[PDB]
Write a protein that binds this ligand. Structure first.
Ligand SMILES: Cc1cc2nc3c(=O)[nH]c(=O)nc-3n(C[C@H](O)[C@H](O)[C@H](O)COP(=O)(O)OP(=O)(O)OC[C@H]3O[C@@H](n4cnc5c(N)ncnc54)[C@H](O)[C@@H]3O)c2cc1C
Ligand SMILES: NC(=O)c1ccc[n+]([C@@H]2O[C@H](COP(=O)([O-])OP(=O)(O)OC[C@H]3O[C@@H](n4cnc5c(N)ncnc54)[C@H](O)[C@@H]3O)[C@@H](O)[C@H]2O)c1
Length: 447
């Protein structure tokens, strides 16, 4: 059986791992058009703040290691096209120019996403940077110590935007963050969490310019101004972190795509064409909070999907169990995490929800180590089933979001969580811990 896997990032890497322990026998070929196998873009923040010195160590596999295992790795080799009927791909060696056609029995593709750019006048004067992959990591690092860079503008206040904003603010620059939405991180967190994080960011001289539409970049040769409908901001560097678009235009006509470019797949990772599976940022995933499919471009999703595509390689035998959209991040002193439905997700999906927010010290009164924690529990008004949660504190309480993710998946209710057995010891929590306390509040509100 010869299996060709496209992509060395998180979806293609786990497909090779599951092929190694489920079909040890197979002939596996692993292709990467880039020069570096399995660079972890997720570690970009740790590197930019100097926690990690070596950019080449921010990775989880090397080609040499996979080759010890019998996989054939082809870096600097691009898959140009798929011929689904004749079970062939045409590959181009990017260092010599040599094209060749390679045959396969099964193809798993994890082509990923690419940074979306604003296509406006000024579109590319120099020093308008993107944030994905090794090369942009190195270039962004160089600008961190550049004495000529004083004003940084980042466009987009979602996860990548707020990570570029914190790394440049910590390096000493003046940062302005621009978004069309009205709250930084609104996609992930609700108003009661983002009001506290706006304060923290402004305390570290980050200006949040929300509710603004960038119209053009101005400058001679390199960027100098970012002008929006309401304002112009001086900029020596712009980082554009406005979201991701699927890397699938080369597949138009070959595989069925949704209108937005995402690949159509079913719950066994099968595409519209026999023997080719698709995984990762370029696909939709079963979203259990709302029993629908959603694009949730996260590494955890891509890794799980990549393994489930190998499970259904020969027979659709194992449907994907679905995910709740869990994500977390530290912004300056705050460590937060959310899962399931928040206000922006419920609006998008037309889901009506109820919520309680509890803000109080997570340790008992006499304990001097006590700090505030914010916990919001979102539930269904009819069944009172758990639909999502958001938590934040300067203490790390984020592993608790993992218990809520299981509670959404098992369809538990506010009453289940009000009395669920979570340990008490006064150096770690209160006798009704953070999940128990918010669920007890929801029970009273529905009494
Ligand atoms: C700054 C940053 C921080 C992030 N942090 C986190 C985090 O902490 N937690 C989290 O869960 N997620 C995080 N993510 C998201 C996560 O990195 C992605 O969800 C995940 O990498 C997507 O996996 P993928 O395999 O679908 O695609 P991609 O990572 O986009 O990888 C696509 C790969 O396939 C290769 N390829 C594409 N086309 C071809 C071709 N035709 N021929 C050959 N090779 C090809 C590409 O060169 C690339 O190597 C972050 C992303 C970024 C940019
Ligand atoms: N901690 C994590 O798990 C982690 C960290 C970084 C990235 N990732 C994932 O990688 C993906 C890409 O991250 P991202 O930060 O690029 O996207 P994102 O979706 O998190 O946020 C994009 C932001 O851009 C804003 N925006 C859109 N168009 C705009 C415009 N024209 N002008 C101004 N603002 C605009 C959006 O409103 C949103 O706030 C996401 O799926 C993200 O969740 C996750």
């Amino acid at each position: 059986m010869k299996v060709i896997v496209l992509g060395s990032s998180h979806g293609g890497y786990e497909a090779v791992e599951e092929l190694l322990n489920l079909h040890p026998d197979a002939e596996i070929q692993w292709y990467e058009k880039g020069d570096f196998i399995s660079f972890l873009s997720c570690g970009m923040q740790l590197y930019l703040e100097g926690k990690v010195k070596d950019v080449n160590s921010v990775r989880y596999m090397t080609g040499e290691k996979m080759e010890s295992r019998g996989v054939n790795v082809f870096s600097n080799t691009e898959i140009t096209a798929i011929q689904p009927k004749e079970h062939q791909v045409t590959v181009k060696d990017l260092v010599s120019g040599e094209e060749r056609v390679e045959n396969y029995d099964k193809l798993i593709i994890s082509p990923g996403a690419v940074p979306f750019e604003l296509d406006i006048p000024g579109k590319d004067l120099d020093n308008i940077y993107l944030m994905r992959g090794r090369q942009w990591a190195i270039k962004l690092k160089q600008k961190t110590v550049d004495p000529e860079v004083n004003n940084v503008v980042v466009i987009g206040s979602g996860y990548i935007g707020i990570e570029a904003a914190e790394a440049f603010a910590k390096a000493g620059k003046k940062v302005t963050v621009i978004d069309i939405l009205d709250r930084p991180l609104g996609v992930y967190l609700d108003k009661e969490f983002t009001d506290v994080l706006t304060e923290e960011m402004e305390a570290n001289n980050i200006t949040i310019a929300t509710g603004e539409t960038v119209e053009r970049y101005e400058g001679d040769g390199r960027v100098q101004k970012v002008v929006t409908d309401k304002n112009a901001y001086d900029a020596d560097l712009v980082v554009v972190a406005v979201g991701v678009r699927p890397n699938t235009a080369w597949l138009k006509g070959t595989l069925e795509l949704h209108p937005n470019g995402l690949i159509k797949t079913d719950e066994y990772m099968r595409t519209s064409e026999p023997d080719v599976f698709a995984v990762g940022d370029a696909t939709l995933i079963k979203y259990n909070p709302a029993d629908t499919e959603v694009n949730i471009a996260l590494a955890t999703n891509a890794r799980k999907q990549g393994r489930f595509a190998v499970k259904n390689l020969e027979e659709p035998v194992k449907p994907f169990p679905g995910v709740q959209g869990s994500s977390g991040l530290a912004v300056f002193d705050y460590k937060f995490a959310s899962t399931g439905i928040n206000e922006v997700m419920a609006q998008k999906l037309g889901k009506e929800t109820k919520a309680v927010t509890v803000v109080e010290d997570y340790l008992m009164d006499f304990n001097p180590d006590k700090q505030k924690a914010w916990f919001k529990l979102v539930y269904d008004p009819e069944t009172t089933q758990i639909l999502g949660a958001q938590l934040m504190s300067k203490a790390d309480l984020t592993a608790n979001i993992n218990a809520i993710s299981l509670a959404i998946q098992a369809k538990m209710t506010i009453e289940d969580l009000a009395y669920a057995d979570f340990f008490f010891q006064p150096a770690f929590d209160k006798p009704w811990n953070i999940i128990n306390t918010a669920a007890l509040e929801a029970v009273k509100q529905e009494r």
